[PDB]
């Protein structure tokens, strides 16, 4: 309700929506600083499109399509240890 | 896609907890699951049974299909529950009904509300099929009128809501078919009657089937999720179980 | 001798008995000439059918 918008809205809430913060909660990156480098280097995709800007806030409907680019060298490492690396998918 | 269901369950359990706190504070409307679609979108129901069902459960499933106007019968041949719930979630189904039997005698009935619960299980007693009736004839499949009698407790209003939305809303005032759910010491007596308004009263005729239920398990989740948090259970071994009433 | 005719239209609202459909078929020998026939199995467009008799005109079969 509107009377809640005046107090519920806080800077921490928008920071939580920030992409590196979301990656940390999704546990893709161990630390917020780490997530920024991965975004800068281009290993992350939010739906169909790659995002290079750490300051991007992911909206609620995009937050589960945030994932890694198919040909990320690190996404290969994900499958190499678990031994689920299927190379038909090129990943 | 797994991350959609993983997140929303946390939202769903959070919503129920907040609703529970609000009700408790009020103690000191329609349920959240049904508040979204109550009186807007007509329910979509799938009726199924256990695997390799006996003939009676197939007919009894056909009966439970006929009771609800928007119900459709589905064979359970070799299906797996995660596949069933995902597949029924896939088709837009609102509720799923599973039936169990013992030597072709229906014993249990379970209702799971989509997309995210709750799941209510029932135990079927004194079941009398209409197939046990000679020359019964065909039914009326109009949107039936609906009666709930002797439901007082908060758990009763919940059981009311779960059974409430299985039917279509807005029957015609002269709709000829009536369904009654009557609790008598947790003993929900269910009858299907058809009437005629006379010049000096009313006369009703049973269509059947006759069959009694006891609720014994309500959980916050789909019937597949055996790890779902439990709202309520029938706890039978208490010394007051022989004389306690809930509904 | 038996003639061959390709279905050119599957008629609708013909009220034929269940399992029977009224169709229109053009003879392969003469594309112009066409005859209405009653067929029992499933039917679709562009399939060809064997007519032993090419004179009888189909009548709606209750």
């Amino acid at each position: 309700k509107i009377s809640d918008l005046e107090n519920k809205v806080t800077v921490s809430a928008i920071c939580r929506r920030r992409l590196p913060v979301i990656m940390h909660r999704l546990k893709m990156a161990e630390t917020i600083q780490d997530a920024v480098k991965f975004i800068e280097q281009g290993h992350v995709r939010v739906g169909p499109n790659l995002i290079n800007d750490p300051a991007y806030l992911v909206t609620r409907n995009m937050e589960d399509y945030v994932t890694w680019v198919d040909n990320s060298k690190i996404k290969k490492t994900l499958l190499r240890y678990r031994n689920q690396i299927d190379d038909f998918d090129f990943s | 896609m797994l991350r959609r269901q993983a997140r929303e369950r946390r939202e769903y359990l959070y919503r129920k907890a907040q609703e529970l706190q609000d009700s408790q504070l009020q103690q000191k409307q329609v349920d959240d699951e049904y508040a979204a679609t109550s009186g807007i979108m007509d329910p979509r129901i799938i009726v199924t049974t256990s695997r390799d069902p006996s003939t009676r459960l197939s007919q009894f499933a056909k009966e439970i299909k006929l009771l609800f106007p928007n119900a459709v019968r589905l064979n359970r041949g070799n299906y797996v529950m995660p596949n069933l719930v995902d597949a029924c979630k896939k088709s837009g189904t609102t509720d799923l009904v599973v039936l169990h039997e013992h030597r072709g005698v229906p014993t249990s009935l379970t209702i799971s509300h989509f997309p995210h619960g709750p799941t209510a299980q029932f135990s079927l007693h004194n079941v009398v099929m209409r197939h046990d009736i000679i020359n019964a004839g065909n039914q009326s499949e109009v949107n039936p009128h609906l009666i709930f009698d002797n439901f007082t407790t908060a758990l009763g209003k919940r059981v009311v809501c779960i059974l409430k939305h299985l039917f279509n809303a807005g029957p015609k005032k002269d709709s000829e078919r009536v369904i009654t759910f009557a609790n008598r010491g947790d003993f929900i007596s269910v009858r299907q009657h058809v009437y005629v308004r006379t010049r000096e009263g009313v006369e009703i005729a049973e269509v059947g089937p006759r069959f009694e239920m006891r609720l014994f398990e309500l959980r916050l989740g789909t019937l597949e999720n055996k790890d779902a948090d439990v709202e309520w259970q029938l706890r039978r071994f208490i010394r007051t179980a022989n004389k306690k009433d809930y509904l | 001798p038996v003639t061959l005719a390709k279905v050119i239209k599957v008629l609708g609202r013909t009220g034929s008995r269940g399992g029977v459909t009224q169709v229109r078929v053009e003879f392969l020998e003469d594309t112009s000439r066409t005859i209405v026939r009653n067929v029992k199995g499933p039917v679709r467009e562009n399939d060809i059918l064997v007519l032993m008799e090419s004179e009888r005109e189909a009548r709606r079969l209750r």
Binding site: - | - | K9, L11, G12, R13, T14, Q22, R24, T31, S32, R33, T34, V36, E57, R60
Partner: protein, 67 residues
């Protein structure tokens, strides 16, 4: 006029062509009495237009001069 219009078209598709020839003859008779045509001219126009559309490939076939 009695035939339902939503059901006119299928009645015309079921029409045998040997009957269509008769229908053209009936339509022929309509124009001699100018009054009968004018009373319900639109319906006569539609029915004639569907019959020919239904059986245009047939109609190009009959080389009969009287037709």
């Amino acid at each position: 006029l009695r035939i339902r219009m939503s059901q006119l078209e299928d009645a015309l598709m079921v029409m045998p062509f040997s009957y269509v020839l008769k229908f053209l003859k009936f339509i022929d008779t309509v124009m001699q009495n100018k009054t009968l045509l004018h009373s319900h001219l639109p319906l006569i126009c539609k029915n004639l237009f569907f019959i020919i559309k239904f059986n245009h490939k047939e109609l190009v076939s009959q080389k009969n001069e009287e037709l």
